[model samples]
Target: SGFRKMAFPSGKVEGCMVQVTCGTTTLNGLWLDDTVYCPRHVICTAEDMLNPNYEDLLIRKSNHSFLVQAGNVQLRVIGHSMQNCLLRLKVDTSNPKTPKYKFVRIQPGQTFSVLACYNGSPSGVYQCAMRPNHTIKGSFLNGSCGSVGFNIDYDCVSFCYMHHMELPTGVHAGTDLEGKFYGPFVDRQTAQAAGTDTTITLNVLAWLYAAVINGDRWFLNRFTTTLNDFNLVAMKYNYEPLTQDHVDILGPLSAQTGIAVLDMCAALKELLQNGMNGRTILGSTILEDEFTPFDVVRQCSGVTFQ
Candidate 1:
């Protein structure tokens, strides 16, 4: 986790109001209840972080893509899961009755100034959403607040169970066209061998090709790639458990090999089809013979895929 750390704001302190910078711009910042929001210069209380009405969400911008500073700590938002791919910030203060509102739009790696606030909160708190439109995003800060953090609410999207087997609506059971067969188990079946027995876990190169070709760039990420490499490659070679303990192993290899998900997928597909030995277990071919990239991606990716 190479990231920055941000501390929660303590209401007991004063004069902690500060300004954060981005290029030539400067923003007003205020701390309260262990959180900081800027451009409006107001601090929020513990009550704000605990729970809020529609008017209580918070939004802050990080000058850098991977860092955000809260109080003294810096939070980092860097991960390849599709949920971390886009940035959407929503801040509000006025209610339907009050009707006063303000918002700031920035990329995952950017932030804004002190516009206004309620108490320590942004007179309106800010919240984020993965824009319905596909895009990459994140937030955070810089400095001796040197530690890094990932605020899932502001940092990542809702835990998308698109490919997860536990959800009844997921594509793991083979879609109307076909499913990927990622499993939870029927209880009666004996546990299968972890790596070799799984289809998606093996020929990751194929899956990447499917995602890239289908225009589902959300899945085109190092997080998913590193994950696939561990499941398919490490399992075959190292016999290691599927836990995160060994995730970094492939990252360096992927970096050395170059880690563009779409580019990597296409290159690997060509290598296997032409350069490599055989396409024996390539993940992409698991679909119907006539299936196209769109078909493979529909079942492999989240709800957003068409």
Candidate 2:
């Protein structure tokens, strides 16, 4: 696919659309003329590229070139191209410059790959010149890297929140809720076999129960919205719907909590009763009458109640 035109943020001309490319497969970056402030993975071979003074900051290959700003350590070409190509460039602070890190140019049809890691962390930035005839693979392996490509695994709190919200598999939670919420709850679940009796967990359950009894529409609405989103995402991902075991456990929890869980489930069912609404899959299996609020919560939290 050809590169799409994108608006440059700090170019010499205002509102100018420049031809720029980045290592990220998703973004079509922009470039500024005559300025050394070029973004990483952004290549602009215009006649008026950066000034000559900034030549040391670039990794050039024939007519195509891109600026290599500080903190930028990795570059690799993705697919085949005749005139322009896509590059995978990343900037990271964890890996500092070292003698081992050097720029390599892979000519047409050539391949260069590196598995760089320093003591379970990324070693350094690997720069590869992108040419239509070459294949470049830059792998920065680290102990914290995730199974999906070079991403780092999320922390415990984030892991719990994303799993709890029933978000798609690849989606990671970048931030977490304030205070001790999912972290402690998840720690307890993983530390022990059964019984999710952490202070935060019990407090949350009690809070939900109180919200239901007090008719706190604000809290209930916020909670119902989450459940609705969870149901829709679960349906989209073909996740297994709540099983009878889930219901069986949630029943006693609801009884102990004065039916707070069941009341929340009823609210969700009522909201989704119209059969169809917007992008939501109404009457999703997870939102059925038998799937209590705590059942969805337990699934997301990966917690088991004894």
Candidate 3:
């Protein structure tokens, strides 16, 4: 639900809401505070709070999102979505039919000027179409606040912009894999549903415990690959290890902090603990298993990045 859609809804927004604002807009089913301030369809499930990176400031500019002024003079984009390039949007209207306007391709850091409704609070609804060659045929109604045709007047100044939802990198922790995978865990949607706290939570370690606690070996099968995929998810958020020796000896429970690494085997050992009894998770051990903590201490050794 946090991903991008190729077009706006043609039928209705029955079970979903579409605008993106932080404590500013309301949807059909749910209301979100600024913490979960993403352009997602709020499900009328239990409300959950997401931990925002308190220090980080995110800036975004896209077709469906923007900044406007009392006077629609300049369009400004405060942030970007990765690749440094230009993006263009073609604008139009639905009712009271208006001509289309093509915005000059917006650059990495730039301001834009549109000729039509450059007078009052910029107003419009969004109707965008995504093409295969990466172009969007958008229908945006731009206008100002003023009366028209004799004396009958309608309000045209009230306007709002959406906050484009931020997705975790699509390549799976920046791995070279062909498709997306959990960094040694479940997908984004499921992890959140299962109460993983927040997206930025230390996922790999928590997920390792999660799988083991639930005896979710199928999850283990998908993610516990050789080294590449394992390390891809494991090391991303300061979760990397020192070696198999460190894991077999020190173990996860004793971990006050970081772990280093070695070959795929060492990575594998760090993944598996032997004498893990008497330990606990929040759900800790749902029951118990062949899982345990390794008691032997060996020397540390292993690989370097390519």
Top candidate by TM-score: 2
Better of 1 and 3 by lDDT: 1
Instruction: Residues 27-53, candidate 1: write the lDDT tens digits.
Output: 333322233333211112234323322
Consecutive 10-residue window with the lowest summed lDDT within model 3? 144-153
Off by over 4 Å in 2: 1-64, 70-257, 260-263, 271-306
Encode model 2's per-residue lDDT on 94-144: one tens digit a residue. 222211211122222111212132222233332221112111223332121
lDDT of 3 by residue, 1-306 (tens): 011111222111111121222233222110111111122212111232143221132232243453222121222333323221111112221112121211122211111111111122222333221111112223223211110100001212111122112123221110001111112322123332211211111223333333333333322222224445544544542333333443453345223222322232233343343323454433444222112221001011111111
lDDT of 3 at 12: 19
For candidate 2, give the lDDT of residue 242.
33
Candidate with maximal lDDT: 1
Each candidate structure's TM-score, on Cα atoms with residue i matched to residue i, is: 0.17, 0.22, 0.17
